[model samples]
Target chain A: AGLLKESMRIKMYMEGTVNGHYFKCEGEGDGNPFAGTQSMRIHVTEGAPLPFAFDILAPCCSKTFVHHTAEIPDFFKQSFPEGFTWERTTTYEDGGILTAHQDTSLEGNCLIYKVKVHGTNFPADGPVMKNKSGGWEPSTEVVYPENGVLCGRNVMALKVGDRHLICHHYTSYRSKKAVRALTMPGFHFTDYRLQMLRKKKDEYFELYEASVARYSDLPEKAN
Target chain B: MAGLLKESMRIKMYMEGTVNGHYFKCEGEGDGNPFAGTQSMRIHVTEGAPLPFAFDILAPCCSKTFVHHTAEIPDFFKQSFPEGFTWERTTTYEDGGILTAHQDTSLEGNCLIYKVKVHGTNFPADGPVMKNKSGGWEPSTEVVYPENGVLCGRNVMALKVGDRHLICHHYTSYRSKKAVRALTMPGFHFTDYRLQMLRKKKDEYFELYEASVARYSDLPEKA
Candidate 1:
């Protein structure tokens, strides 16, 4: 999921009076600093065997990208192999910052994971971001994971060419990781995993184009 | 689309002491295969392109791998860019090995393509298939793609692997490649693209999934 879902950029250097035809940027795999996607919301919570965990992301300073509000379905709660019980949920629409570091709330009773996405989706078409002058646009929201036990939540967001985002919310109650704080080198959207997941996330976006079935309007399906 | 969807083998090394790894096939990156949940149908005129372009596959042979079915939809003459089209639509469904290769009938022009695809939402849910014989089922029928437009009627079928079974059929005036085929390579379920485009036919399958959704017990969505 990491390699497939995150966004990234590649970079290149040029010499004087030389012409080249290649594209590049600063991203996780490329190891560039100038190119990346940005995530705005960060919620950190911890409790004994939490029910759900999540984060919020908006690319291009909260404009253009969709905001995902995601949650694990109640059905998954009973499937925990170890049978851990806990409840933890956080809304991600209120923040405005590129997570420069790992800031998720790690519960003392859950297992600590470095980078593994259980499940996430974008449920809202995303609030149309404000202009440089602070004006909001009316945008329809969309749900990701198109089908599932937790299909209604918008779990991630981003625009092209911003920064990548990362979140680790899990239920490993009583695992050794439960007592430790997962470290983030920095919360920069340019971080490695952010760059990775962003790529897959972008594919999900591209597919939305087809998923919406642009040619045959739903009303005309039978015609 | 070609490089994006490929056939891969999920090799689980059975033992370390010796060279032992059983090969379980799956749809991999950059190959023209559909994702597990994708639902789409193709309607090709008798004059359309002939399929099985390569000798690597057998239509009915893959019946046990994925759920296949056929449906009838109105013909689409032509449209703008990014609009979806059919994978195969013919005037007949037969078991004659090796269909005549051709393109959509553009001459007399009174034909349509039959939309056929795997029925989604089956028990144990169709995931990436590694091996075969799980549900003890195979595609029930094989409808041949026709060579002339509207000269004959149309019927189609596909093998399916899901919680339930479904079949499709159609009739048209002219076009080729009418015989419904598998966008999902045998062994691979859904690539990220297939998940988005509803298999290689893109728009065709997208509409099919939506249509089925409208008529059947609403499929429970997940994230």
Candidate 2:
């Protein structure tokens, strides 16, 4: 065996429909710095840049990392006459946690959204949702805004709901639990977008629109 | 002695533009394109295709340059099949620099073969590792197939200690360089035909496979 010097490895698994065209984006090893993180970005042709689609940093020895869209068979668009709110808590096999919260008031068409996580040695301040296995054991509830402003076109009253995604995490070769499966942090996310339209008659209207994550990550900079 | 230097040429091709009808430039310094002073540019190239990917040399190997391979893809090969893929590099010295590469087609076997190689001081093993670094493989939520679409055996990593070069071959269809066996998609079909078979009763007999070139070129193409 040659000195078995330092070696690195990576793989990309992606599939989606873009502008009506279905494409598969897979490849491996050529010198990428972000080798171990589930880091990815989506560039909407019409937008400057959607916030980092995802940047889930895994544990030091987390080997297997997978993320994909879940099923969108059941979708509902309802208007919250008073307001709306949703929350979710997630935990990884290794005891990590990821929690999210969102709220929008009909009285004051305003939106406040936040996502936080712990257990991976990375800590944050906020309501920490405990990690539960077998999918995002999400717990959600809604309440109307009390002192907030009313709904408006620019209030960003958008609710991404019924979006499905799946992720699979595994122990890394460097980890003591190598080859074992991680049940909690399967990295799935929604593929569709839901925008809360202005109140048409008496209730706020929400629309479910189709989108694509199946595009090339080709750096847009000109060579 | 080594062959004499015939001539040399240099030019800067933006990562976003089409060169010789090929668009393999992936990323660079600013945005996706390379900044003038940047060390290198990422590129994509196939064995028989005309497009050229970018590769930059570090300060210690700045005198190194690209030596375009003059191989050709026969006319009969289906245009839709991704075939004859390879990339190479060299330094100012006759045999003192570095070389890196990947391959999908075999001129001798007259078939598609997947291979990769790297050597010399330039291609330091310390750099980042990436997946499908080139847009050469089909991506999906699952392991569909190997980048080149065929398998002769389990993915193998070839290393020679006595020699002054490094070459590794991947027979498996996963991300890690440590993959020991091939993985296939549950419902996938590949069209790779084996041309050689052992004779039942051998009397020192050898078989040579034959094929024809579909098109002609002034440059005298190779299989």
Candidate 3:
């Protein structure tokens, strides 16, 4: 088989309305970034500037970079006060019968989503509280699309006390630890190796020369 | 790309006035409004005001600017006015870079000048991190009602009721072309909803900024 099918070994499916434009794409992914993250392709949309695909980490996987061994600070994941939850689960429109998760209560306002990890709970203490296995992890994110990059605001609300807030502002992708899941776009896979690309003045250059993606890393159909 | 062009003018402004005779002052300076900490301000009574009588005020990112403001009585100001009052302060910094001040108070209540109290967030930012910083979020035990303005992510925001003050560091997704997620801190938590002050507070200051430091300090000991 050609590298096309080999690349499928790590394909991820994604579709969403970005800058009011409909976008859909499949790209290489790696769970090594965190427990619940997907690196989806950044499609060709005139209004959308980033020439790369980025990663959106599930709430449970946001605080620390899983591939490395750094104890993450817990202040960034408390997404809401006690009992109140938030989350989102997206499915590509072209991916057969699956659909985007919807909640009528938050019809117009962004609704919450829950992620259930069937196996372990080792890195249980995360920004999105109650992230243990079997429990639904929650997060409400607002991603800002810049000229070509994406700035993320992964909120950590207060879940322990009656009311508390310890916030921070981290946008630059330079700090791998601070922006563990941003991916900063355009990481493609070849038959023998995975790679990352950065474009400058119309020229694409190699950023990382990279992974064997997990089964769920690819969209259901691609897997 | 020209360095320090009009940013010194458009992004920064100051408020130095009273509500029916109380003395209060604060300025707008920063890259983002609340990141410097919960946007804060200080209130006092006279040039000879008591160190104890001098107090500080804090609010989330809501109003467009801190100087030209409009708000329901903030709790700190609310307790003094029973029935309620509408407060406004205006200044024209541009016509000549000359600073002038004026105020309007629709108080069903009485002289707010009398309510100026002694216990509150201390004057002057702490050493180092907040060195030359003027008004805005500077965490301290002195934070008047710590709960009143909790730090959510830098993009987290609130909206002012009336208009006049055009501050920064806030977003209303439904109202704007931009999209933002929502969450609450303890005091900022919304069971229903609460309104106080909105907009810019903690921003980077220029050579023009100054904290009302003289009146808020203790007499040098054992002279």
User: Best lDDT goes to which candidate?
Assistant: 3
TM-scores for all predictions = 0.21, 0.18, 0.23
The alpha-carbon deviation from the true structure for residue A82 of candidate 3, after best TM-score superposition, in angstroms, is 20
- Candidate 1 docking category? incorrect
Tens digit per residue, CA lDDT, model 2, B83-138: 22222223222123233233222222222223333233432322211110111111
Candidate 1, B1-223: lDDT as tens digits: 1231222211111101000122122111111112121223322212212221210111211101111222221222221102223233222111222221122211111112222322111112122122221122111111122232222222222223343212222232223233334122111010011111123331111111211110111112112
Better of 1 and 2 by TM-score: 1
DockQ (Cα-based) per candidate? 0.03, 0.01, 0.02
Residue B114, candidate 2: Cα error in Å is 8.8
Q: Rate the local accuracy (lDDT) of all candidates.
A: 0.19, 0.21, 0.22
Error of 2 at A32 (Å): 35
Q: A78-177, model 2: which lDDT tens digit per residue?
A: 1223223333333332233434333322222211112122223222221112111111211101111111211100000011132212222211111112
lDDT of 1 by residue, A1-223 (tens): 1121233222111111001111111111111111212332212222211121111221111111112112212221222222222212222333322221111122322221122111123222322122111111111111112112111111232221222121111111121122122211110010011221212211111001001101111221222
Give residue A24's lDDT in candidate 3 (0 to 100): 44
Model 1 ranges with Cα > 4 A deviation: A1-40, A43-75, A79-223, B1-110, B113-223
Per TM-score, the best of the predicted structures is: 3
Chain B in candidate 1 has what TM-score? Answer: 0.18
**What lDDT, from 0 to 1, does candidate 3 have?**
0.22
Task: State the RMSD for candidate 2.
Answer: 24.8
